[PDB]
mmCIF file of C-alpha atoms and ligand atoms in Angstrom:
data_model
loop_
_atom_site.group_PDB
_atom_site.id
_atom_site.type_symbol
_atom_site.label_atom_id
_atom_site.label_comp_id
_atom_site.label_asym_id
_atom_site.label_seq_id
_atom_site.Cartn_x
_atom_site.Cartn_y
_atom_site.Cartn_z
ATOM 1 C CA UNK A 8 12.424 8.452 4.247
ATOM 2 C CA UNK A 9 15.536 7.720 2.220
ATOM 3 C CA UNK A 10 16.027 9.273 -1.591
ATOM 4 C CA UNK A 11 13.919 7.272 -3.639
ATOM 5 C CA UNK A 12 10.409 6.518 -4.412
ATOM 6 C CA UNK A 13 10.589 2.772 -5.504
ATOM 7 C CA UNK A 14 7.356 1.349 -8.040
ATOM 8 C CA UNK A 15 7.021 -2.677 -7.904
ATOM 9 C CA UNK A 16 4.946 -4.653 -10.324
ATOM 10 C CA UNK A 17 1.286 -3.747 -10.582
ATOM 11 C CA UNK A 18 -1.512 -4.423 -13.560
ATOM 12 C CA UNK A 19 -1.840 -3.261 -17.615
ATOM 13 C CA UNK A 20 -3.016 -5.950 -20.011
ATOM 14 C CA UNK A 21 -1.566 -8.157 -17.279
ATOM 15 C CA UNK A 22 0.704 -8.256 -14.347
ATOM 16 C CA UNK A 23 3.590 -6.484 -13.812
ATOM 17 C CA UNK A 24 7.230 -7.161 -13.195
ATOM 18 C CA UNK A 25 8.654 -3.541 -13.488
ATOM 19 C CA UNK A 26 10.884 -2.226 -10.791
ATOM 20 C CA UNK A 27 11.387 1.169 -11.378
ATOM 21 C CA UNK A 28 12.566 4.314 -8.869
ATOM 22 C CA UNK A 29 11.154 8.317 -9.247
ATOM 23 C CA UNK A 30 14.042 11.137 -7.616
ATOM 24 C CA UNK A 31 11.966 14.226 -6.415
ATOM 25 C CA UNK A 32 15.137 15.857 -6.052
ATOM 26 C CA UNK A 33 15.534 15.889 -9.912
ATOM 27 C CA UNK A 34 12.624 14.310 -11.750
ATOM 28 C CA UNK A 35 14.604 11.124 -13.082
ATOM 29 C CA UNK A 36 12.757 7.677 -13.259
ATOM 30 C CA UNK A 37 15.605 4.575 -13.254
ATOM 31 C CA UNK A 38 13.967 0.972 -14.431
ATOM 32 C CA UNK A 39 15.788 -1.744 -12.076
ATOM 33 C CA UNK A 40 16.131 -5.381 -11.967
ATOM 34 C CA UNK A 41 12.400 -6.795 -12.591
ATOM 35 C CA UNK A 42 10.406 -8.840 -10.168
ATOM 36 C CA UNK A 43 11.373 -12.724 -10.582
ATOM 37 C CA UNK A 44 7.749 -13.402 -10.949
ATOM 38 C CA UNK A 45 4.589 -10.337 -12.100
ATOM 39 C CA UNK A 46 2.299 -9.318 -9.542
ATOM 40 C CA UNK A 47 -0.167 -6.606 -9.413
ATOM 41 C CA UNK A 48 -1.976 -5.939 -6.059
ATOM 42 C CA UNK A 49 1.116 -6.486 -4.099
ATOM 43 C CA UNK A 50 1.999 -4.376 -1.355
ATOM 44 C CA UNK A 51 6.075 -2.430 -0.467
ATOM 45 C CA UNK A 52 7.474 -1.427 2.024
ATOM 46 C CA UNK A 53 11.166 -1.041 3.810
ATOM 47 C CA UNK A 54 12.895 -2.142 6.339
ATOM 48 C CA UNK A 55 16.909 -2.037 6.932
ATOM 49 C CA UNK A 56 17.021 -0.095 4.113
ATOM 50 C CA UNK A 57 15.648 -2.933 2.325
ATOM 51 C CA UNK A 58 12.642 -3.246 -0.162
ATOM 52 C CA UNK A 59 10.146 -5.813 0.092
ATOM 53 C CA UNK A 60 7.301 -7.123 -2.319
ATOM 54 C CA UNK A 61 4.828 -8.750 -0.162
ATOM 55 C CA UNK A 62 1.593 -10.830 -1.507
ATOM 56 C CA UNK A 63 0.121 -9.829 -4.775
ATOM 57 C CA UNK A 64 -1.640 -12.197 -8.349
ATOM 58 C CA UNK A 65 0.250 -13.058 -11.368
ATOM 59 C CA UNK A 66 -2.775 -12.291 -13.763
ATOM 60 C CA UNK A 67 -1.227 -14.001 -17.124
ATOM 61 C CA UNK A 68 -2.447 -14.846 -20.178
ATOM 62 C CA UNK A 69 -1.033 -18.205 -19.200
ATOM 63 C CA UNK A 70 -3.532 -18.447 -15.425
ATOM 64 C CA UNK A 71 -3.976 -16.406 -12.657
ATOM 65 C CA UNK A 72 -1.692 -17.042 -9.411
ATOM 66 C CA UNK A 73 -2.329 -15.392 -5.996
ATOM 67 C CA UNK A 74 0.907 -14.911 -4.241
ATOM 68 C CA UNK A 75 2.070 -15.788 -0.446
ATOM 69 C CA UNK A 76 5.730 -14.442 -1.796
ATOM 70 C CA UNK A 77 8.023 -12.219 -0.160
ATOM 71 C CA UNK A 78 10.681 -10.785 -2.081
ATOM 72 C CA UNK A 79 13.383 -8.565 -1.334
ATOM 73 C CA UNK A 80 15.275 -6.202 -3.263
ATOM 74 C CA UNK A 81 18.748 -4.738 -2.168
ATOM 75 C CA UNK A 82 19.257 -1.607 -3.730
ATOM 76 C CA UNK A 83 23.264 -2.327 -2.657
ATOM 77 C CA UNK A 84 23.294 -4.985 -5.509
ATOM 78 C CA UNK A 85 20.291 -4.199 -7.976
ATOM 79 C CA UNK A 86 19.439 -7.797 -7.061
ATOM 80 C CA UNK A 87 15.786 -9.859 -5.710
ATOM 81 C CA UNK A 88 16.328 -12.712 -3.040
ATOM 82 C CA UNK A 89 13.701 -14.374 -1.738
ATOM 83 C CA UNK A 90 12.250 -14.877 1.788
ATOM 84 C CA UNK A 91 9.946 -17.077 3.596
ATOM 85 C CA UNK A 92 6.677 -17.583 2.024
ATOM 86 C CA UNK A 93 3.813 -16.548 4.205
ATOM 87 C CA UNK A 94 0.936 -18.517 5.271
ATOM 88 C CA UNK A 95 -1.539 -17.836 2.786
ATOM 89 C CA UNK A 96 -1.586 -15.998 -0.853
ATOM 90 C CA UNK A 97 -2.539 -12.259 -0.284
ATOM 91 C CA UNK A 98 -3.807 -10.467 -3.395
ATOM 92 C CA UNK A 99 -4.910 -6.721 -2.590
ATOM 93 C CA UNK A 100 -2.692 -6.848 0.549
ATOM 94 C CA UNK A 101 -2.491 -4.077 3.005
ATOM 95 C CA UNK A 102 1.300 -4.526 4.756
ATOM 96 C CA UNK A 103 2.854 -1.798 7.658
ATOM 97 C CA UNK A 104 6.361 -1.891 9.517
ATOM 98 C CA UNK A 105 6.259 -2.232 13.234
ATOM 99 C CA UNK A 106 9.887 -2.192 15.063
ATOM 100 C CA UNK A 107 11.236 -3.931 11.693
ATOM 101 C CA UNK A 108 9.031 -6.386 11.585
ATOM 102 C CA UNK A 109 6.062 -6.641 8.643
ATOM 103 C CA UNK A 110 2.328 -6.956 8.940
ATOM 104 C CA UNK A 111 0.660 -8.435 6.448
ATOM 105 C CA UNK A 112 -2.804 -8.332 6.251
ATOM 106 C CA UNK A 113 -6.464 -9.358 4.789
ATOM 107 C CA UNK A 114 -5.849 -9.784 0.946
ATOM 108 C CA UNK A 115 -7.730 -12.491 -0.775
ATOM 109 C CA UNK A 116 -6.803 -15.890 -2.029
ATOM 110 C CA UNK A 117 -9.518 -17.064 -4.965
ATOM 111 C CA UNK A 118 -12.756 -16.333 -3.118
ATOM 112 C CA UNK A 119 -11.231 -16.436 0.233
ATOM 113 C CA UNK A 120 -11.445 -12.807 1.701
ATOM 114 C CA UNK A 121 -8.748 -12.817 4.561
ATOM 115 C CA UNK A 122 -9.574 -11.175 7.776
ATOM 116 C CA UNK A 123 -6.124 -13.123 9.676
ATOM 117 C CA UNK A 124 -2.787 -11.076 9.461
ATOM 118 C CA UNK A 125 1.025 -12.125 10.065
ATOM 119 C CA UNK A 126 4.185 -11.061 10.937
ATOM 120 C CA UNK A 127 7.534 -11.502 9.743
ATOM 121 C CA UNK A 128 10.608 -11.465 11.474
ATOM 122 C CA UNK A 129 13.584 -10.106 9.087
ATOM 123 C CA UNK A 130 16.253 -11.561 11.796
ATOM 124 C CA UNK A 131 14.503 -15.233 11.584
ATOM 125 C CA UNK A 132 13.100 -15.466 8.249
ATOM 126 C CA UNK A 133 10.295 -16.189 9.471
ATOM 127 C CA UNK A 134 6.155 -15.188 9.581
ATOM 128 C CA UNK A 135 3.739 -15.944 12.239
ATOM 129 C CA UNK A 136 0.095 -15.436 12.711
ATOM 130 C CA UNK A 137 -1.483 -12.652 14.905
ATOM 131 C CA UNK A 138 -4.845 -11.922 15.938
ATOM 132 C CA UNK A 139 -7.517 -11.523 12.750
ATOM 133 C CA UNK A 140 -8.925 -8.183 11.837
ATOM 134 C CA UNK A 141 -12.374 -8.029 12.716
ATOM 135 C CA UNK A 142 -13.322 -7.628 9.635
ATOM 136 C CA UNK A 143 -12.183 -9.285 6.221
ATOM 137 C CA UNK A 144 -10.616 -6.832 3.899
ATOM 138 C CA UNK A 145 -9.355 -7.170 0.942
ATOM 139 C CA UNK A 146 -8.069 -3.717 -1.322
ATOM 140 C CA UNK A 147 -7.180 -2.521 2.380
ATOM 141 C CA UNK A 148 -5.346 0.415 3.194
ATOM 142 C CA UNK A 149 -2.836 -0.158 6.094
ATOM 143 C CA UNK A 150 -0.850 2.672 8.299
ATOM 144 C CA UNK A 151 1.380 2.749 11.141
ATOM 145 C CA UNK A 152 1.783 5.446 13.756
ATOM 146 C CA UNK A 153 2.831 5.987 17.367
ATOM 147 C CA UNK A 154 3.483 1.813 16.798
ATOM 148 C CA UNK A 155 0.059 0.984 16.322
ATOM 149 C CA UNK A 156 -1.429 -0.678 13.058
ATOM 150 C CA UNK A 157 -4.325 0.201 11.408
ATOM 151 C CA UNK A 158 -6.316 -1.583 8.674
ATOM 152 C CA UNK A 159 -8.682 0.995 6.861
ATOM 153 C CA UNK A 160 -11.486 0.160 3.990
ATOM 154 C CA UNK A 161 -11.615 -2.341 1.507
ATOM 155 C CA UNK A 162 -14.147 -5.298 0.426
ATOM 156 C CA UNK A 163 -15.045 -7.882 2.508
ATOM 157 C CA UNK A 164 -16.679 -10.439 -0.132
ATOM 158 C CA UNK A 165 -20.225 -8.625 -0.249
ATOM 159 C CA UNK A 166 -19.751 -4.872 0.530
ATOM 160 C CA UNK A 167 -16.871 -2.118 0.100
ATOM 161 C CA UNK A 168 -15.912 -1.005 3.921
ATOM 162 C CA UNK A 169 -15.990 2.666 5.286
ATOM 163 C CA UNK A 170 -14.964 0.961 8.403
ATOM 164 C CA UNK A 171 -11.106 0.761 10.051
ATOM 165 C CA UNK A 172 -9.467 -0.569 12.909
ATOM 166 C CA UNK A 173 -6.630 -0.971 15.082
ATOM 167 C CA UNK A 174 -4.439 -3.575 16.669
ATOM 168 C CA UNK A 175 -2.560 -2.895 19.654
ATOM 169 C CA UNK A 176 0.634 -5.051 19.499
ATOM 170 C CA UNK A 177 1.069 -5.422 23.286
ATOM 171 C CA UNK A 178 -2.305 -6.861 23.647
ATOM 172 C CA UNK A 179 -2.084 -8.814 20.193
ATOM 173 C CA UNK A 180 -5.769 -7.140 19.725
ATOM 174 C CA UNK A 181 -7.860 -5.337 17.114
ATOM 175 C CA UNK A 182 -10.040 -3.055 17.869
ATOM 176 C CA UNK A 183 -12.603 -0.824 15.454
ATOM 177 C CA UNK A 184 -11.804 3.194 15.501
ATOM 178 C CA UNK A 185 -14.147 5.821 14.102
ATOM 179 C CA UNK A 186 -15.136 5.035 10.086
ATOM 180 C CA UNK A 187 -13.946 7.165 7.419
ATOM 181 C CA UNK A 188 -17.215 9.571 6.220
ATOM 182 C CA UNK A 189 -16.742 7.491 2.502
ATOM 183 C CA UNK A 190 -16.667 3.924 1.624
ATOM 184 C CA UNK A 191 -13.476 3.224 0.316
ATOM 185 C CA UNK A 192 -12.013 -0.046 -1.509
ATOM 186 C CA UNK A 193 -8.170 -0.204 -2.903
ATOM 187 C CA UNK A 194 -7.564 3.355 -1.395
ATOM 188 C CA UNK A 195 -3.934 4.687 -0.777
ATOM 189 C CA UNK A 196 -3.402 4.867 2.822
ATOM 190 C CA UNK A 197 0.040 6.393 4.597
ATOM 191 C CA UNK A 198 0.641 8.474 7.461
ATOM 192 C CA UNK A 199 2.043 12.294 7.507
ATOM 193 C CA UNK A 200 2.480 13.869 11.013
ATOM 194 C CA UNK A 201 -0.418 12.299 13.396
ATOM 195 C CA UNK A 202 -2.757 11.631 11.228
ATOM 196 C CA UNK A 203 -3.438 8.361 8.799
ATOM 197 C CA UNK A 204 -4.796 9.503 5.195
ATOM 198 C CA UNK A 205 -7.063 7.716 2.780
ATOM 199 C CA UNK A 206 -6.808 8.931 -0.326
ATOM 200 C CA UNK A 207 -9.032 7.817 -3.401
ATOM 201 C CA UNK A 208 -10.218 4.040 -3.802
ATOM 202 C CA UNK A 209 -13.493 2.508 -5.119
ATOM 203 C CA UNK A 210 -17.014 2.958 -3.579
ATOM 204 C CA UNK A 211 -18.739 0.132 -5.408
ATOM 205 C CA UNK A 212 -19.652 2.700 -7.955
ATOM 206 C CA UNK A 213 -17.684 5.545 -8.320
ATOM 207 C CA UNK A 214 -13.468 5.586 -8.468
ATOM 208 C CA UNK A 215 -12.959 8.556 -5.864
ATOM 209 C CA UNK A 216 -10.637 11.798 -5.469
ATOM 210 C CA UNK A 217 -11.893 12.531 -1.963
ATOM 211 C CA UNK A 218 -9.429 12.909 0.245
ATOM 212 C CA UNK A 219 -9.468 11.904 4.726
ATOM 213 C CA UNK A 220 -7.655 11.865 7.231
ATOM 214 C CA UNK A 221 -7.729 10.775 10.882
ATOM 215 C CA UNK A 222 -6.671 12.323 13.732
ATOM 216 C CA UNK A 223 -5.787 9.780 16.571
ATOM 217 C CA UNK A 224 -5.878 12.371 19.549
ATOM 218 C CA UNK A 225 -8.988 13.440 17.823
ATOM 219 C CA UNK A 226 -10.797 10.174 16.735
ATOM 220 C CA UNK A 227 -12.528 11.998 14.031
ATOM 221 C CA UNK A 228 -12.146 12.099 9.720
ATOM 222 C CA UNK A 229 -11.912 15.341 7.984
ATOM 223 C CA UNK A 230 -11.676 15.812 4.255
ATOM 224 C CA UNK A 231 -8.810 17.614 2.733
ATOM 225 C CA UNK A 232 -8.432 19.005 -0.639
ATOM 226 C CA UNK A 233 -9.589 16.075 -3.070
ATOM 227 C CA UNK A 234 -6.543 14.706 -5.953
ATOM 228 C CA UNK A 235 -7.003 16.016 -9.326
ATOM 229 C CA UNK A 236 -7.379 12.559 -10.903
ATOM 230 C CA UNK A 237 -10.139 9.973 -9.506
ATOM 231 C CA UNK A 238 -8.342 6.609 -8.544
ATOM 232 C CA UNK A 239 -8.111 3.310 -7.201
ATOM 233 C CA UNK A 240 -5.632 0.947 -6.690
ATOM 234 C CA UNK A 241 -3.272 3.675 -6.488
ATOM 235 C CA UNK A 242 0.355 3.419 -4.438
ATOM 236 C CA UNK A 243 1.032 6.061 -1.599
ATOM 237 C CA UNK A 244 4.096 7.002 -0.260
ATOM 238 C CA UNK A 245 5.662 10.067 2.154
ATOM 239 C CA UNK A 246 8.447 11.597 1.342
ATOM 240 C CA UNK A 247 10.306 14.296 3.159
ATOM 241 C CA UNK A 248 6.697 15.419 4.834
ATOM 242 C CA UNK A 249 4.931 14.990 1.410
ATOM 243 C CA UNK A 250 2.440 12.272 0.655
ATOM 244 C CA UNK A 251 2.571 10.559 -3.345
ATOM 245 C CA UNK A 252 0.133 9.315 -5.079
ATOM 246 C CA UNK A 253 1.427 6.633 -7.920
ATOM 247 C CA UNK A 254 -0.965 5.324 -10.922
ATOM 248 C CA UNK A 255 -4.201 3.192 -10.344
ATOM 249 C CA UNK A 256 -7.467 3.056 -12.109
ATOM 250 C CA UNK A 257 -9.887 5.809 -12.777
ATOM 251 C CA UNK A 258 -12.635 3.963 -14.438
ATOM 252 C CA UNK A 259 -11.713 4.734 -18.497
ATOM 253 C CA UNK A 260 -7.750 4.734 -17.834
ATOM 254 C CA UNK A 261 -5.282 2.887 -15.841
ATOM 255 C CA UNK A 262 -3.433 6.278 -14.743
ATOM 256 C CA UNK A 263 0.259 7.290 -15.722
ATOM 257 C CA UNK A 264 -0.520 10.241 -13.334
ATOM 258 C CA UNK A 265 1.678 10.682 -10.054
ATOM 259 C CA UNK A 266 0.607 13.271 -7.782
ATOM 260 C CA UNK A 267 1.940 15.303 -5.065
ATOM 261 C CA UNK A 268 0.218 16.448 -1.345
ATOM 262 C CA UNK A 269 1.630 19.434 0.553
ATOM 263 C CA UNK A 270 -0.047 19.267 3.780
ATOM 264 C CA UNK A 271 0.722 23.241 4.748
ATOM 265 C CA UNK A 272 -0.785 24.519 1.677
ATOM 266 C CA UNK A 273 -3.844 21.431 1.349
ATOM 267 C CA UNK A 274 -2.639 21.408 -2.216
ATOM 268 C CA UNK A 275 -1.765 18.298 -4.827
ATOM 269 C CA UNK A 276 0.084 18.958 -7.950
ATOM 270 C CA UNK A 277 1.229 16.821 -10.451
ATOM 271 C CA UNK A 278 4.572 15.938 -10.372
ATOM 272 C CA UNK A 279 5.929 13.229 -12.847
ATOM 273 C CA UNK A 280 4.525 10.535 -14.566
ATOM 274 C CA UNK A 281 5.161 7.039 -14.555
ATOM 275 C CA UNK A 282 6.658 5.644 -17.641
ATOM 276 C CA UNK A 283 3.616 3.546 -18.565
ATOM 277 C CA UNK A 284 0.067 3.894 -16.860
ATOM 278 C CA UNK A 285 -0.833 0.969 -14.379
ATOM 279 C CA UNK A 286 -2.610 0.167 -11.013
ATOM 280 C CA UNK A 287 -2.062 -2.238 -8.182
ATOM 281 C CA UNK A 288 1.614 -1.322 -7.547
ATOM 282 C CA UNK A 289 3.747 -1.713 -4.332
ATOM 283 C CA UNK A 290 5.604 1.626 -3.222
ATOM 284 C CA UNK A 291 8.027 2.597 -0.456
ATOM 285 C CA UNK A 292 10.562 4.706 0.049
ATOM 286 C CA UNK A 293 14.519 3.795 0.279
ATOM 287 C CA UNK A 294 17.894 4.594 -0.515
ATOM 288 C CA UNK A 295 19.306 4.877 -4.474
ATOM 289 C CA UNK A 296 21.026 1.925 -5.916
ATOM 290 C CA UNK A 297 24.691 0.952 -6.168
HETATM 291 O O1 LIG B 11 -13.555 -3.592 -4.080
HETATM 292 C C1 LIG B 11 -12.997 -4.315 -4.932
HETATM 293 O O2 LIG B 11 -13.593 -5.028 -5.774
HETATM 294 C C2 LIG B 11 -11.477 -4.330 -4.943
HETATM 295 C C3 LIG B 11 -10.880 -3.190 -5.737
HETATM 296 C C4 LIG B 11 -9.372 -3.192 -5.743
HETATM 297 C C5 LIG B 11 -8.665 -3.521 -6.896
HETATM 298 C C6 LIG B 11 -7.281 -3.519 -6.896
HETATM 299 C C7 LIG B 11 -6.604 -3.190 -5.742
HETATM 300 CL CL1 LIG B 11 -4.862 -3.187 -5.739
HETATM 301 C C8 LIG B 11 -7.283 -2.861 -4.593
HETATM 302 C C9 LIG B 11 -8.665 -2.862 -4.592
#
């Protein structure tokens, strides 16, 4: 975990450069040093008690710029360095920490829908290509448990994916697991106890509050009790055994709304909002600043 839920960028009117951090221990939201450039669809996460904002698209009234960027923000100094660029621009990235290194993966670039996926090396600076997915996915949710990697949902150029899969480091090797019961696209997916979750995301039709989870001992999805707001493009988080559920898009608002899971009770609550509604953000989970 850490202390505090971190919010990068994301999408209202246009892209994003907010950086701002929620306390559950006391409610407080602190706005911090913005993203050097706006980005919506990017993905967070943390490693070394670092934050990094991976991929993303400046949508601006001034053009529209998928982003191969890597950012990272030491909460130390309140300050954004960047890193090594990665192969390809990654809109709607899915990313997931392995042994401190980062997995990008899928994301689109124009109408390029990636299926190939790198890894970065904090100690090098430096990414490299892995296997591809088997699938191209774009809006995909991406987990990490027992040091495993798994890409779940998203949209593939033509259809919106119920399907997931896994890649096996050791082997450098995807392989397809059991699909989620609902077709997801640009749902939040994390991992509480032994189980990955897909909460919410787009169907092709519907925005959805359904909530899923997978058991890997199990190899089987089972609903849990759904959010109260309907959303897509929504961040996820865990913190202190708790999942969070940031913003995102419910087809009539882009959502203020964060809400809470308690796994022993199968209850979500609101907790806090955001201080403006928007979707598309990047969220993890670090220390507080300075
Ligand atoms: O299925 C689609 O068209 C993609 C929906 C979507 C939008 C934004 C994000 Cl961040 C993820 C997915």
């Amino acid at each position: 975990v850490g202390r505090l839920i971190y919010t990068a960028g994301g999408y209202f009117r246009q892209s994003l450069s907010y950086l701002e951090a929620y306390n559950p221990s006391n409610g407080s939201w602190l706005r911090l040093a913005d993203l050097q450039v706006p980005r919506s669809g990017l993905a967070g996460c943390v490693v070394g008690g670092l934050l990094y904002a991976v991929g993303g698209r400046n949508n601006s009234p001034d053009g529209n710029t998928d982003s191969s960027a890597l950012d990272c923000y030491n909460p130390m100094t309140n300050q954004w360095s960047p890193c090594a660029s990665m192969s390809v621009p990654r809109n709607r990235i899915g990313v997931g920490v392995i042994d401190g290194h980062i997995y990008a993966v899928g994301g689109s670039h124009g109408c390029i829908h990636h299926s190939s996926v790198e890894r970065y090396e904090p100690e090098r600076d430096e990414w490299h290509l892995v296997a591809p997915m088997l699938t191209r996915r774009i809006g995909v949710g991406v987990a990490v448990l027992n040091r495993l990697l798994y890409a779940v949902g998203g949209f593939d150029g033509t259809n919106r994916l119920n399907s997931a899969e896994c890649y096996y480091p050791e082997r450098n090797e995807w392989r397809m697991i059991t699909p989620m019961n609902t077709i997801r696209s640009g749902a939040g997916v994390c991992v509480l106890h032994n189980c990955i979750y897909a909460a919410g995301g787009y169907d092709g039709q519907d925005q959805l509050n359904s909530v899923e989870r997978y058991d890997v001992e199990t190899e089987t999805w089972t609903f849990v009790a759904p959010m109260r707001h309907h959303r897509s493009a929504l961040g996820i988080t865990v913190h202190q055994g708790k999942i969070y559920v940031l913003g995102g898009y419910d087809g009539h608002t882009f959502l203020d709304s964060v809400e809470c899971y308690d796994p022993d009770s199968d209850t979500w609550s609101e907790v806090t909002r955001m201080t403006s509604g928007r979707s598309g953000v990047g969220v993890a989970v670090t220390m507080e600043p300075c």
